[PDB]
């Protein structure tokens, strides 16, 4: 029972998130109790990621490091640069540009693992690239964010590294330990992971939307269009990054999805933690978490149909 509702909730995530977002846009007091808990809500999500990691998920890293490295490089070369170029070309306000760049600087999101499966790409590659990007993000996300956004607002890069360590790295390590400890019984914790992760992230979105209602009223449509462009250009450059390195079609699909899909929950949590007096900074991350599941689903559905799915 717990499993099949998890799949339905997974397929309908953007609808649930959109309704919670609407509820927060008309009743901000609704989810403002969750604001202070955003880092912990993300911590739970990343704790779930650690519970599902296994040593065989890194077999491809030691057998085929170059393809994995290509994916990780494409992640941190395309999405931060794309966020900066969009911010400059569209002349976005500093607050919004910082939040868009912040999203672009985060690692990939584990949802890319599922979209890659649905798209019939290389799932082992998707899992490896997301895992590696995530584990090195405490160093790379602040470093790139500092370089691209440091002239817009004051950035405490070392402080953000420690935030990622506490919200990402330690929960993952706790998840790895708990799993090595529990062994096979861990399946009974991960049976709850999809619904818990969905509840946590919609709470983050609702808290972010409520705190920035006024800014969404004046800039909500602009931010949405930037997210669509940022996510979409990611797919495009990820695809051709794979094609021009000579990788096969299944890997092209994987890195398309890997690059365009982001750990946008982390971007929202970092903005809440470090830019709390500017709530709109977290809005790009919140919207990205919704849109990239819609866009990734459309892309995966398209590629599955091309691969012969009835």
Ligand X SMILES: CCCCCCCC/C=C/CCCCCCCC(=O)OC[C@@H](O)CO
Ligand Y SMILES: CCCCCCCCCCCCCCCCCCCC(=O)O[C@H](COC(=O)CCCCCCCCCCCCCC)COP(=O)(O)OCCN
Annotated binding residues = 110-111, 263, 265, 293
Per CB under 5 A, the segment of 26-34, 130-138, 146-154, 302-310 that binds Ni ion is 302-310
User: Residue 130 binds which entry of ligand X, Na ion, ligand Y, none, with Cβ cut-offs from 5 to 8 Å by kind?
Assistant: Na ion
User: Interface with Na ion includes 112 (CB under 5 A)?
Assistant: yes
CA dist 129 and 264 (Å) reads 16
Q: Smallest gap, in angstroms, from Cβ of residue 122 to ligand Y? A: 14
Q: Is 310 an interacting residue with respect to Ni ion (CB under 5 A)?
A: yes
Contact segment (CB under 6 A) with ligand Y among 68-76, 232-240, 263-271, 281-289 equals 232-240
Among 32, 64, 166, 213, which residue interacts with ligand X (rule: CB under 6 A)? Answer: 166
Measured in whole angstroms, the distance separating CA 2 from the mean position of its chain's CA atoms is 25
CA distance 23 to 115: 28
Q: For the chain, how many residues are written?
A: 310
Residue nearest to ligand Y (CB): 232
Q: How far is the CB of 241 from ligand Y (least distance, A)?
A: 11
**293 burial class (0-12, 13-18, 19+ CB within 10 angstroms)?**
buried
Instruction: Kindly tell me which of 119 and 223 has the beta carbon lying closer to Na ion.
Output: 119
- Of all residues in the shown chain, the one whose CB is closest to Ni ion is 310
Q: For residue 186, give the H/E element and its range.
A: none
- Give the position of tokens 């992230």: 201
Cβ 31 to ligand X shortest distance, Å: 13
Annotated binding site for (R)-pantoate: 110-111, 263, 265, 293
Q: Are 29 and 210 in contact (CB under 8 A)?
A: yes
Given the structure tokens 């649905």, which residue do they identify? 118
Which of Na ion, Ni ion, ligand X, none has residue 310 at its interface (CB below 5 to 8 Å by kind)? Ni ion
Binds Na ion (CB under 5 A): choice among 87, 126, 141, 293: 126
When CB distances are held under 5 to 8 angstroms depending on the partner's kind, the choice from Ni ion, Na ion, ligand X, none that residue 149 binds is none
13 CB burial (10 A radius; 0-12, 13-18, 19+): buried
Which among ligand Y, ligand X, Ni ion, none contacts residue 121 (Cβ within 5 to 8 A by kind)? none
Residues with Cβ < 8 Å from 75, sequence gap 6 or more? 107, 108, 129, 133, 258, 259
Give the nearest residue (CB) to ligand X: 43
User: Does 157 engage in binding with ligand X (CB under 6 A)?
Assistant: no
- C-alpha distances in Å from residue 2, one per residue of 77, 102, 219, 232: 39, 35, 39, 33
Residues 6, 122, 130, 163: which binds Na ion (CB under 5 A)? Answer: 130
Which residues neighbour 229 within 8 Å (Cβ) at sequence distance 6 or greater?
Answer: 86
Task: Mark 188-207 with x for binding to ligand X (rule: CB under 6 A) and - for no binding.
Answer: --------x-----------
Binders of ligand Y among 235-274, rule CB under 6 A?
Answer: 235-236, 239, 256
# residues contacting Na ion (CB under 5 A): 7
d(CA 102, CA 245): 27
First to last CA, the chain: 26
Give the interface with ligand X as residue ranges (CB under 6 A).
Answer: 35-36, 38-40, 43-44, 47, 55, 58, 132, 135-136, 163, 166-167, 171, 196, 272-273
């Amino acid at each position: 029972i717990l499993s099949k509702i998890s799949s339905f909730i997974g397929k309908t995530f953007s609808l649930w998130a959109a309704l919670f977002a609407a509820a927060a846009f008309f009743a901000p007091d609704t989810f403002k109790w969750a604001g202070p808990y955003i880092p912990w809500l993300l911590g739970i999500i990343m704790f779930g990621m650690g519970l599902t990691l296994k040593p065989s998920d890194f077999d491809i890293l030691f057998k085929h490091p170059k393809v994995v490295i290509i994916g990780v490089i494409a992640q941190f070369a395309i999405m931060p640069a794309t966020a900066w170029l969009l911010s400059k070309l569209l002349n976005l306000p500093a607050e919004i540009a910082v939040g868009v760049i912040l999203v672009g600087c985060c690692p990939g999101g584990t949802a890319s693992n599922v979209m890659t499966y649905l798209a019939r790409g290389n799932v082992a590659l998707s899992v490896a690239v997301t895992s590696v990007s995530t584990l090195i993000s405490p160093l790379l996300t602040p470093a790139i964010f500092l370089m691209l956004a440091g002239e817009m607002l004051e950035i405490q890069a070392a402080g953000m590294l420690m935030s990622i360590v506490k919200m990402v790295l330690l929960p993952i390590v706790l998840g790895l330990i708990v799993h090595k400890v529990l062994g096979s019984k861990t399946e009974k914790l991960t049976d709850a992971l999809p619904l818990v992760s969905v509840a946590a992230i919609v709470l983050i979105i609702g808290a972010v939307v409520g705190a920035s209602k006024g800014k969404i009223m004046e800039s909500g449509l602009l931010i949405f269009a930037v997210v669509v462009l940022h996510n979409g250009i990611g797919y495009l450059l990820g695809f051709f990054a794979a094609k021009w390195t000579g990788l096969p079609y299944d890997a092209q699909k994987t890195l398309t999805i890997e690059v365009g899909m982001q750990n946008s929950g982390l971007a929202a949590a970092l903005a809440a933690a470090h830019f709390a007096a500017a709530p709109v900074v977290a809005v790009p991350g919140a919207l990205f978490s919704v849109w990239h599941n819609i866009s990734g689903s459309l892309l995966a559905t398209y590629w599955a149909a091309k691969a012969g799915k009835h």
